[PDB]
Amino acid sequence: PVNYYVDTAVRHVLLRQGVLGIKVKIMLPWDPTGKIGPKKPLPDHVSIVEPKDEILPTTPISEQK
Amino acid sequence: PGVTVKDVNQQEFVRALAAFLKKSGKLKVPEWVDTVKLAKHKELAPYDENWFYTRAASTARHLYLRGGAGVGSMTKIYGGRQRNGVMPSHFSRGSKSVARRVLQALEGLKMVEKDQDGGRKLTPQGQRDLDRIAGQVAAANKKH
Amino acid sequence: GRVRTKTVKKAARVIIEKYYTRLGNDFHTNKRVCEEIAIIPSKKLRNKIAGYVTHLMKRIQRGPVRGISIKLQEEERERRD
Amino acid sequence: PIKLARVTKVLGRTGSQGQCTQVRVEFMDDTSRSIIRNVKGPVREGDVLTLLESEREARRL
Amino acid sequence: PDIKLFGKWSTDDVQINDISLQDYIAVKEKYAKYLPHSAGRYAAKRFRKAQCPIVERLTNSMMMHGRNNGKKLMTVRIVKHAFEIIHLLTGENPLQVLVNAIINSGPREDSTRIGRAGTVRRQAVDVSPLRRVNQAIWLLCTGAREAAFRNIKTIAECLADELINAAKGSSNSYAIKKKDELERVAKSNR
Amino acid sequence: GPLQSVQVFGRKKTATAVAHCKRGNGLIKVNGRPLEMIEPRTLQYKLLEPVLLLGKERFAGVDIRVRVKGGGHVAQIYAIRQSISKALVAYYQKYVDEASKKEIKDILIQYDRTLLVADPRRCESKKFGGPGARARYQKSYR
Amino acid sequence: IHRIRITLTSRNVKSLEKVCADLIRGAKEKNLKVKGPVRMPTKTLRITTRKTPCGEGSKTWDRFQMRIHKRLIDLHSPSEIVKQITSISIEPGVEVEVTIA
RNA sequence: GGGCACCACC
RNA sequence: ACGAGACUCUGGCAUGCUAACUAGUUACGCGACCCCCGAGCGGUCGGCGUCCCCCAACUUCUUAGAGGGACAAGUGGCGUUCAGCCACCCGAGAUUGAGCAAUAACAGGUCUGUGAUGCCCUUAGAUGUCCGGGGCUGCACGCGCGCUACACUGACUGGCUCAGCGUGUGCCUACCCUACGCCGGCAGGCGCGGGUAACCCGUUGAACCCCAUUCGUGAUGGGGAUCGGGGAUUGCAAUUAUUCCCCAUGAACGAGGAAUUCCCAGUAAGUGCGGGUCAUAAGCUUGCGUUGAUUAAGUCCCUGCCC
Ligand SMILES: [Mg+2]
Ligand SMILES: [Mg+2]
Ligand SMILES: [Mg+2]
Ligand SMILES: [Mg+2]
Ligand SMILES: [Mg+2]
Ligand SMILES: [Mg+2]
Ligand SMILES: [Mg+2]
Ligand SMILES: [Mg+2]
Ligand SMILES: [Mg+2]
Ligand SMILES: [Mg+2]
Ligand SMILES: [Mg+2]
Ligand SMILES: [Mg+2]
Ligand SMILES: [Mg+2]
Ligand SMILES: [Mg+2]
Ligand SMILES: [Mg+2]
Ligand SMILES: [Mg+2]
Ligand SMILES: [Mg+2]
Ligand SMILES: [Mg+2]
Ligand SMILES: [Mg+2]
Ligand SMILES: [Mg+2]
Ligand SMILES: [Mg+2]
Ligand SMILES: [Mg+2]
Ligand SMILES: [Mg+2]
Ligand SMILES: [Mg+2]
Ligand SMILES: [Mg+2]
Ligand SMILES: [Mg+2]
Ligand SMILES: [Mg+2]
Ligand SMILES: [Mg+2]
Ligand SMILES: [Mg+2]
Ligand SMILES: [Mg+2]
Ligand SMILES: [Mg+2]
Ligand SMILES: [Mg+2]
């Protein structure tokens, strides 16, 4: 996941007394579309959906339509 | 109940075919057969003085099994390992002037002919001779 | 070793808490339910979660577990107690 | 005399490098008999050991 | 059908006289094979090599030294010739001779070392049956190997002589001498 | 006479042998050659094991032709054995009852499981820093 | 009516298979005869180098690898329809070559 | 005083 | 929360799916040869048709896509009966091998990889840059990584029979892989073709291994160092021998002291083959197959590192 979730950049800047080195790492957010982030999620993130409300059955009802 | 070449043992077949070629007496033998070794990785000349007939028989059998082989293919067939002093061994090919003369001598017997694609193959007469030799080998093996 | 990391255990416990009715003692039916309800981006992780869910369901059937508690189980224990 | 014994339970690993195994062995002639022995080599329960001298006993761990 | 090693040596008549080693020598009906070559996976799990036939174990242990590693067809041929020579010399089943040699060659009591690199002190211990079989096979192969070196005598003849002497119990064999010395040292380390 | 035949393969490290088994009189050949002419002849019994275990009676109604390729000599022999056994079992399954297949399969499996189930072992990759997969180059101090 | 061969070369398989599926669907929507796609063996270029810019330390090696995938499609059709279906096929990363045998 | 490792031993 | 796991590549299973003349199988025609005592619905064929006007089907074998499949799931024990461990059934598989890899540091290596770079030094009699010739390899002696051996489980001479990973005609840039025919005893030389590659080399006729022959415990037909005389290739140029070939010569070495290295299954070892370097070119390295084990399923005694 480092390959597609992390963006890295290394640069050099020449100042009066020598060279300084700059390293920047940015971790992209999860985006369902591929616009500003990876489409696929992190491998170990499991999202369990919340169950929907169900009406408790009381009496057998037959509906014809 | 017809015997073919693949049915019999190959070493006995080579021996019998070499004996047949020697007894025929129409094979042409180079003058330098007694002064040469068969490859550059060999140390000595062949022990058997009638080695030319054996090599011709082996070449005919190989052309029977896999036709269209040229001088380079025969050279690769008979190549072997070369030990060179204190250095590691390596694969080495045979002598081209022996393979070429064996093929030419077999063509002189009307047993080998030029292939259309390239190389040499067997004539129907050569195939007939090899099948007859195979039948003789099988009969000798079964009778004893 | 075959110890399960906390990811699998947490996912299995949450699945059992939320969907106790749909689960059972069968590994294959459990692994079919898990992909229906949960989002696991790996096949091996889904298999591990289902295999722990089956073990936990068997343990629950044997008796109460130190961790998760089912609403139906709590209501039944109220009648027991 | 030479005796034969049956390994009843494997106890542990002894030795400076752990080379020996401490086990409990019961004599074939007298099933009531049982001592503690040190064995060299892989040994499991049910093996038969040949005791050249059967009086010696080993200091268990 | 009847399965005979190399097509001529049967296994029904062979019997093992040691109760301890019965569970670790595989020569009997379900372990009867035509050749000592099976390409099996016996080293995958512990104690699994007790199910390997003993002839194949001898064949495996005969592929030494490093100039002979992996050459198992030559070893099978050597074993075949040695069995033929043993049958000619003794007149009995060479499988029985091999079983007797392995039974006699296995040390029964050993000495375990507690050594500060120079000086070593020892204490007598017992030997498990599996180690007895292993050490017997190793001793027999080593004796044959040392006999055949720098001598006009085939490795098969030396192996046959070593096996015959070990089965006979004679001290002319390498394995019997080694076993005797190991047991003497173990006795003195009690 | 319906044309009934089965082609089944067997494998060793890289060697693959495919056996075509059809209705016939008892012919069994490998690359056109008889079983007794395959080399090396040191391992000839390994090649005759299925026939000896099952007898010529069960092979007397089929013709089998094997084509081998890849690997070495020993691997090719061990592939040929498995191809022959599996081809006979698959033929009996389709064109004979299930009981005969069960008998043959039990007999073959009791003697050796590699007659019907392949060996998964393959060569391991070399790693830099040593001659092979596990061995390392000789270390030196001072 | 010409026998026309389309050769598709790519470095990733997802785009290559997407393009192949698009071409097959487009051609078969015109009631044409299509053979393939037949997949050639994958090519693997390897470069093994030392990690260190100098000659100091443990001898460690990088193993860089590039994979090339190749597909073939055969079509019995006139040139114009092939160019019609090909014009859409332009995709980033896939090299498409059309030849008339 | 414990734990681990064929770049430790057995 | 990072690291560990998860993840990616890889190796094993699919007669289930998708579909192939740059992969094949089977069948059917033509042809060659053998058996006229069984001549046949006979055997062998890497010999030719079967897609391209019309003259066969199908993916088992070969390639590579999509999916399945294994989770300590089932059983029996041992455990706080938990976390987990052992064994067994079924099963292709009940631990395949690598890649990536945290917080903190080292005056660790690299200015000789860079048109990365700060300061010094030099800059026309140059520390710039070309040309010619030498050196880096020089030998009383010590130390490492290795190759070949000390033989009969061998050497020699014949015969027979099996791989896999890969490369190949180049902006400058000259230098590619080679089938077949002839000449030479060999290194090689002439012709004439294919390949920018599942198409040609190539069915990559590899070596160990296997079957026969000779030798016979003799520093021997083991071993092949050091030297002499010839021949040929690469180059502008071969002497301080580039490499290769042929006759001849025939050293130490009979298994190695103190000490010490690597390794747990297709592994160690044996044996060859590709790539890098490469006008000429492997005793090195990095990969690939082939043959294929002994021993162990433990411990903290030595060494070392952590709590
Ligand atoms: Mg050869
Ligand atoms: Mg040599
Ligand atoms: Mg000898
Ligand atoms: Mg290997
Ligand atoms: Mg190796
Ligand atoms: Mg040691
Ligand atoms: Mg398939
Ligand atoms: Mg410093
Ligand atoms: Mg630098
Ligand atoms: Mg600089
Ligand atoms: Mg500077
Ligand atoms: Mg430098
Ligand atoms: Mg000049
Ligand atoms: Mg100069
Ligand atoms: Mg130098
Ligand atoms: Mg070094
Ligand atoms: Mg060395
Ligand atoms: Mg080396
Ligand atoms: Mg040999
Ligand atoms: Mg010699
Ligand atoms: Mg000779
Ligand atoms: Mg030879
Ligand atoms: Mg000499
Ligand atoms: Mg000599
Ligand atoms: Mg000269
Ligand atoms: Mg010089
Ligand atoms: Mg010479
Ligand atoms: Mg050390
Ligand atoms: Mg190499
Ligand atoms: Mg080179
Ligand atoms: Mg170098
Ligand atoms: Mg310690």
The DSSP annotation for B74-143 comes to: HHHHT-EEEEETTEEEEEE-B-HHHHHHHHHHHHHTTSEEE-SSSSEEE-HHHHHHHHHHHHHHHHHHHH
Q: Smallest CA–C1' separation from D18: which nucleotide?
A: I299
Distance (Å) from the alpha carbon of G10 to chain F's nearest alpha carbon: 28
Q: Smallest CA–C1' separation from D15: which nucleotide?
A: I299
Both tokens assigned to B99: 């393979």
Mutate: best of E4, E71, E73, partner F, most F CBs <10 A: E73
Domain boundaries, chain G: 1-101
Structure-solving method: cryo-EM
Place of tokens 């001659």: F131
Max Cα-Cα span within chain C:
43
Cα–Cα distances (Å) from E55 to A58, E38, E59, E179, F28, in that order, read 76, 11, 6, 21, 31
Question: G69 preceded by cis ω (within 30°)?
Answer: no
How far apart are alpha carbons F15 and C16 in whole angstroms? 49
- Domain extent at residue D56: 1-61
How far apart are alpha carbons B6 and B130 in whole angstroms? 11
How far apart are alpha carbons F66 and C65 in whole angstroms? 60
Per-residue DSSP letter, B39: B
Place of tokens 């693949």: B6
How far in angstroms lies nucleotide I118's C1' from the CA of residue A11? Answer: 18
How far apart are alpha carbons E16 and B56 in whole angstroms? 57
Chain A residues touching residue C45 (CB < 8 angstroms): 43-44, 46
Burial of A15 (0-12, 13-18, 19+ CB in 10 A): exposed
Beta bridge partners, G68, equal G43
Would you give the distance in Å from CA B62 to the centre of its chain? 7
Cα–Cα distances (Å) from G58 to A63, F130, G51, in that order, read 78, 13, 10
What is the number of the ligand closest to the CA of G53?
Answer: 9
Those chains having 3 or more beta-carbon pairs within 8 angstroms of chain B are F
* Contact status, residue E176 vs residue E142, Cβ threshold 8 Å: no
How far apart are alpha carbons G20 and G22 in whole angstroms? 5
Both tokens assigned to G68: 């090339």
What angle do the packed helices C43-62 and C27-37 form, to 10 degrees? 120
How far apart are alpha carbons F14 and F76 in whole angstroms? 9
What is the number of the ligand closest to the CA of F126?
Answer: 4
**CB under 8 Å to E138, separation ≥6 — which residues?**
E61
Cα–Cα distances (Å) from G89 to E43, E127, G5, G20, G78, in that order, read 57, 77, 15, 9, 18
CATH number for the domain that contains residue C33 = 1.10.60.20
How far in angstroms lies nucleotide I102's C1' from the CA of residue G65? Answer: 28
CA angle, C23 then C26 then C30, to 5° = 45
**Side-chain-facing half-sphere of E160: CA atoms under 13 Å:** 22
Total structural domains in chain D? Answer: 1
How far in angstroms lies nucleotide I126's C1' from the CA of residue C74? Answer: 96
Per-residue DSSP letter, C21: T
Q: Smallest CA–C1' separation from G71: which nucleotide?
A: I64
| Interchain touch F–D (≥3 Cβ pairs closer than 8 Å) | no
Chain E residues touching residue D16 (CB < 8 angstroms): 114
- Listed as ranges, the nucleotides of chain H within 7 A of a protein C-beta are 7, 9-10
D42 to E110: CB separation less than 8 angstroms, yes or no:
no
**CB under 8 Å to D7, separation ≥6 — which residues?**
D23, D24, D25, D43, D44, D45, D46, D47, D48, D49
Q: Smallest CA–C1' separation from B14: which nucleotide?
A: I159
81-140 of F, contacting G, C-beta below 8 A: 128-129
- Among E27, E183, E32, which Cα is nearest to E104's? E183
Q: Smallest CA–C1' separation from B76: which nucleotide?
A: I205
Those chains having 3 or more beta-carbon pairs within 8 angstroms of chain A are C
Region of residue E39 (left: phi > 0; alpha: psi -120 to 50; beta: else): left
- C73 belongs to a structural domain: no
Place of tokens 């019961």: D26
Those chains having 3 or more beta-carbon pairs within 8 angstroms of chain E are D, F
CA angle, G60 then G66 then G67, to 5° = 140
Distance (Å) from the alpha carbon of C23 to chain A's nearest alpha carbon: 14
- Listed as ranges, the nucleotides of chain I within 7 A of a protein C-beta are 4-8, 10-13, 15, 19-22, 25-27, 32-35, 38, 40-47, 52, 60-66, 68-74, 82-85, 87-88, 92-93, 96-98, 100-101, 108-110, 113, 116-118, 144-149, 151-154, 156-167, 178-188, 198, 202-203, 205-211, 213-214, 216-217, 223-225, 245-247, 254, 259, 261-273, 275, 282-301
Phi, psi for residue G48 in degrees, rounded to 5: -110, 125
How far apart are alpha carbons E63 and E79 in whole angstroms? 11
**CB under 8 Å to E175, separation ≥6 — which residues?**
E101, E104, E105, E136, E139, E140, E143, E162, E166
Identify residue G12 by its one-letter amino acid code: N
* Contact status, residue B56 vs residue B105, Cβ threshold 8 Å: yes
Phi, psi for residue C58 in degrees, rounded to 5: -60, -45
* Contact status, residue C23 vs residue C53, Cβ threshold 8 Å: yes
Burial of F33 (0-12, 13-18, 19+ CB in 10 A): middle
Identify residue E180 by its one-letter amino acid code: D
Residues 25-44, chain B, CB closer than 7 Å to nucleic strand I: 32, 36-40, 42-44
- Among E110, E92, E109, which Cα is nearest to E167's? E92
How far apart are alpha carbons E32 and E27 in whole angstroms? 6
How far apart are alpha carbons E42 and E51 in whole angstroms? 8
The DSSP annotation for G41-74 comes to: PPEEEEEEEES-SSS-SS--EEEEEEEEEEEEEE
Burial of C30 (0-12, 13-18, 19+ CB in 10 A): buried
Identify residue A10 by its one-letter amino acid code: V
What is the number of the ligand closest to the CA of B91?
Answer: 1
Residues 33-52, chain C, CB closer than 7 Å to nucleic strand I: 42-45, 47-48, 50-52
Total structural domains in chain F? Answer: 1
Beta bridge partners, G76, equal G3
Burial of F103 (0-12, 13-18, 19+ CB in 10 A): middle
Region of residue F30 (left: phi > 0; alpha: psi -120 to 50; beta: else): beta
How far apart are alpha carbons E138 and E81 in whole angstroms? 20
Kindly determine whether the C-beta of residue G12 is less than 7 Å away from any atom of nucleic acid strand I: no
Both tokens assigned to A56: 């408790």
Kindly determine whether the C-beta of residue E66 is less than 7 Å away from any atom of nucleic acid strand I: yes
Total structural domains in chain C? Answer: 1
Those chains having 3 or more beta-carbon pairs within 8 angstroms of chain D are E
Instruction: Give residues after which chain F gaps, C-N over 2.5 angstroms.
Output: none
**Buried-state track G5-41, b at ≥16 Cβ within 10 A, e below 16:** bbebbbeeeebbbebbeebbebbeeeeeebebbeeee
- Domain extent at residue F50: 1-142
**Identity of the residue in E7, E37, E41 whose CB atom sits nearest the CB atom of F43:** E37
| Entry field: residues in chain C | 81
What angle do the packed helices E155-168 and E174-188 form, to 10 degrees? 50
- Residue A27, classed as helix, strand or coil, is strand
Kindly determine whether the C-beta of residue F28 is less than 7 Å away from any atom of nucleic acid strand I: no
The DSSP annotation for chain F comes to: ----EEEEEEE-SS-EEEEEEEESSS-EEETTEEGGG-S-GGGHHHHHHHHHHH-HHHHTTEEEEEEEESS-HHHHHHHHHHHHHHHHHHHHHHHS-HHHHHHHHHHHHHH-GGGTS-----PPPP-TTSSSSS--PPP---
Resolution value (Å, 1 decimal): 2.8
Place of tokens 């808490």: C17
How far apart are alpha carbons E79 and E56 in whole angstroms? 10
| Interchain touch B–F (≥3 Cβ pairs closer than 8 Å) | yes
How far apart are alpha carbons E106 and E99 in whole angstroms? 11
Both tokens assigned to F112: 């050796």
C39 to A49: CB separation less than 8 angstroms, yes or no:
yes
Place of tokens 């996941």: A1
Report the Cα–Cα distance between both ends of chain F, in Å, rounded.
Answer: 82
- Residue B66, classed as helix, strand or coil, is coil
How far in angstroms lies nucleotide I182's C1' from the CA of residue B71? Answer: 12
* Contact status, residue D6 vs residue E23, Cβ threshold 8 Å: no
Handedness of CA C49, C53, C59, C65 (dihedral sign): positive
Ligand 20 centroid, distance to G1 Cα (angstroms): 70
Region of residue G52 (left: phi > 0; alpha: psi -120 to 50; beta: else): beta
Chain A residues touching residue C11 (CB < 8 angstroms): 46, 48
**Buried-state track E151-190, b at ≥16 Cβ within 10 A, e below 16:** eeeebbbbbbbbbbbbbbeeeebbbbebbeebbeebeebe
How far apart are alpha carbons C43 and C50 in whole angstroms? 11
Residues 36-65, chain E, CB closer than 7 Å to nucleic strand I: 37, 39, 41-46, 49, 52, 57, 60-64
- Domain extent at residue C57: 1-61
C41 to A50: CB separation less than 8 angstroms, yes or no:
no
56-75 of E, contacting D, C-beta below 8 A: none
Domain boundaries, chain E: 1-190
Alpha helix stretches (DSSP H) within chain C: 6-18, 27-37, 43-62, 71-80
Sheet holding D48-51, edge to edge: D48-51, D3-14, D20-27, D35-40, E120-127, E109-115
Distance (Å) from the alpha carbon of G72 to chain F's nearest alpha carbon: 28
Cα–Cα distances (Å) from F112 to F8, F81, F101, F107, in that order, read 18, 11, 16, 9
- Residue E114, classed as helix, strand or coil, is strand
**Side-chain-facing half-sphere of F109: CA atoms under 13 Å:** 8
How far apart are alpha carbons G65 and G44 in whole angstroms? 7
Q: Smallest CA–C1' separation from B121: which nucleotide?
A: I47
Distance (Å) from the alpha carbon of D48 to chain E's nearest alpha carbon: 5
* Contact status, residue F128 vs residue F102, Cβ threshold 8 Å: no
How far apart are alpha carbons B64 and B7 in whole angstroms? 13
- Among E178, E189, E179, E180, which Cα is nearest to E121's? E189
Ligand 3 centroid, distance to A25 Cα (angstroms): 72
What is the number of the ligand closest to the CA of E144?
Answer: 3
